[PDB]
Amino acid sequence: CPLMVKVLDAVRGSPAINVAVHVFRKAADDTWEPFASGKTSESGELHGLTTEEEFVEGIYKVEIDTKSYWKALGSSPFHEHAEVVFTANDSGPRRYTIAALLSPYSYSTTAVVTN
Amino acid sequence: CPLMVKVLDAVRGSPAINVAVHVFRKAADDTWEPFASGKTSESGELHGLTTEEEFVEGIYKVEIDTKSYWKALGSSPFHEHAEVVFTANDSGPRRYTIAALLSPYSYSTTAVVTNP
Amino acid sequence: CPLMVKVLDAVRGSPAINVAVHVFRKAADDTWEPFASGKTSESGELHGLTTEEEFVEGIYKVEIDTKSYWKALGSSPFHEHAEVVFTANDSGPRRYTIAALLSPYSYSTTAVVTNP
Amino acid sequence: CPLMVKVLDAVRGSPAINVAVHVFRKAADDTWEPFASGKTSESGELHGLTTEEEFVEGIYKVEIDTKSYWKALGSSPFHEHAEVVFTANDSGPRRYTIAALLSPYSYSTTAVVTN
Numbered sequence: 252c253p254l255m256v257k258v259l260d261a262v263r264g265s266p267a268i269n270v271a272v273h274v275f276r277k278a279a280d281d282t283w284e285p286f287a288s289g290k291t292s293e294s295g296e297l298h299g300l301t302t303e304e305e306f307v308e309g310i311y312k313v314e315i316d317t318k319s320y321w322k323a324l325g326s327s328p329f330h331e332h333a334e335v336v337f338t339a340n341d342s343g344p345r346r347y348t349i350a351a352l353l354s355p356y357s358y359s360t361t362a363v364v365t366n
Numbered sequence: 367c368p369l370m371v372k373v374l375d376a377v378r379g380s381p382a383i384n385v386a387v388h389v390f391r392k393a394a395d396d397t398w399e400p401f402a403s404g405k406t407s408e409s410g411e412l413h414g415l416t417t418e419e420e421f422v423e424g425i426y427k428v429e430i431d432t433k434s435y436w437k438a439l440g441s442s443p444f445h446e447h448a449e450v451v452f453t454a455n456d457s458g459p460r461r462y463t464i465a466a467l468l469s470p471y472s473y474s475t476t477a478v479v480t481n482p
Numbered sequence: 483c484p485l486m487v488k489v490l491d492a493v494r495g496s497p498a499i500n501v502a503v504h505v506f507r508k509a510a511d512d513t514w515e516p517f518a519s520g521k522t523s524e525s526g527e528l529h530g531l532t533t534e535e536e537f538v539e540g541i542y543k544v545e546i547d548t549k550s551y552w553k554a555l556g557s558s559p560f561h562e563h564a565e566v567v568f569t570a571n572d573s574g575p576r577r578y579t580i581a582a583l584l585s586p587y588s589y590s591t592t593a594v595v596t597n598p
Numbered sequence: 599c600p601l602m603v604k605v606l607d608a609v610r611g612s613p614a615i616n617v618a619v620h621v622f623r624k625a626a627d628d629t630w631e632p633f634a635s636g637k638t639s640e641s642g643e644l645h646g647l648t649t650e651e652e653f654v655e656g657i658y659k660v661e662i663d664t665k666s667y668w669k670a671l672g673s674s675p676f677h678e679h680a681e682v683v684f685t686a687n688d689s690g691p692r693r694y695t696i697a698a699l700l701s702p703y704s705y706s707t708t709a710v711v712t713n
């Protein structure tokens with residue numbers, strides 16, 4: 252599993268459950284091409300987005316649908332979504348985790364790149 | 367000044383100086399139109415992006431050019447940039463500050479919104 | 483002003499106002515001695531904690547009273563407080579800003595250090 | 599496992615490995631009483647600190663030895679350590695994860711409290 256996403260909620264102190272996540276890859280013409288998608292689990296995690304075969308080097312965008320998340324909780328949020336854009340490079344380690352911590356007016360994100 | 371950006375550097379314990387910032391506004395046709403740009407000062411602050419008159423209601427994208435910042439420091443970072451996308455001024459004019467904290471493999475951003 | 487604190491609120495998208503801050507200094511006997519205290523203003527900023535003369539070399543603890551802040555807003559938070567502990571002025575006088583971002587179950591803090 | 603700690607490194611984009619962590623419980627006289635300790639694993643995680651039996655309600659402090667961590671990497675850090683102080687309450691969910699993201703002049707921490 253080369254690409255995982257984990258999302259936490261800083262207001263409730265819990266995983267962010269049932270958040271839609273869409274991943275895109277940058278195409279040669281500079282447009283965003285759909286690549287993978289899913290909803291986070293009870294543990295705030297999304298696995299099995301892709302295989303090693305399909306996950307080639309390039310620029311990827313992970314879009315997290317935070318607006319729908321907050322509204323479903325009755326909270327008015329600031330952002331239209333949260334977007335994480337990065338380069339996958341074969342020289343570095345091969346397993347990528349994109350982790351995000353959400354609040355209504357703020358978010359933080361880090362990368363954990365292993366083995 | 368209705369739209370400001372302030373950026374700090376978590377590795378140096380200092381303001382993030384000379385960070386390029388580009389702002390876009392979603393157009394009636396649904397693509398990103400260039401709206402304003404600038405770079406942070408020695409205090410890590412960017413003022414004078416726009417005016418009250420020109421900063422009308424819309425969906426704005428503030429793109430903080432984190433990769434160019436780290437690369438100019440000779441460091442290889444993870445992200446291409448940090449984007450903050452939000453609806454602005456839909457309840458009348460407000461003043462917005464986007465505050466950010468940068469590390470090579472992480473960033474945090476928050477918004478400070480003032481005014482009736 | 484050689485020691486300042488600035489605090490933002492991630493839930494309201496605003497400065498964190500009326501946050502109590504207590505600073506302690508480790509004493510020759512190795513316990514925490516009270517050093518200074520204050521509360522943040524409407525801009526989320528706390529100035530005037532100490533003076534250049536009194537802010538000598540040592541190990542300082544800046545305790546940001548996050549629980550009292552959230553409880554005064556009628557919210558039940560997780561942490562008792564946020565502590566930032568650091569050696570100061572060991573290479574001569576510097577100016578320090580401790581910047582923090584608060585949510586009910588999370589906080590972030592960073593330091594900005596200026597001067598030769 | 600009622601109490602877990604997970605530590606990440608924002609400079610390298612990796613787990614924070616082999617970081618000493620000491621947990622204390624507040625005693626009736628307001629002093630900090632040693633409770634549990636360990637070093638984070640290859641995945642930045644520390645498990646098996648305590649049992650449900652010993653983990654009673656009260657105030658706890660999780661001290662992370664970040665200074666030693668950064669110095670072992672050749673980096674001069676700002677903090678003497680990172681401390682996370684919180685109340686364990688039986689009314690809320692029963693599994694606590696304390697997560698921390700480290701940089702030399704900064705750290706962030708959140709709580710993930712589940713089932």
Ligand SMILES: O=C(O)C1(c2ccc(-c3ccc(Cl)c(Cl)c3)c(F)c2)CC1
Nearest residue numbers: 350351352359360361604697698699706
């Ligand atoms: O398996 C992981 O990576 C976990 C994790 C631990 C810490 C965080 C976290 C902690 C702090 C910040 Cl600022 C950010 Cl962006 C992320 C996170 F999002 C996830 C423990 C769940």
Ligand SMILES: O=C(O)C1(c2ccc(-c3ccc(Cl)c(Cl)c3)c(F)c2)CC1
Nearest residue numbers: 465466467474475476488581582583590
């Ligand atoms: O002018 C402000 O608002 C200041 C400020 C204070 C705190 C931060 C800060 C502190 C922590 C985080 Cl996680 C974030 Cl995203 C921002 C910040 F970026 C800037 C004091 C400089």
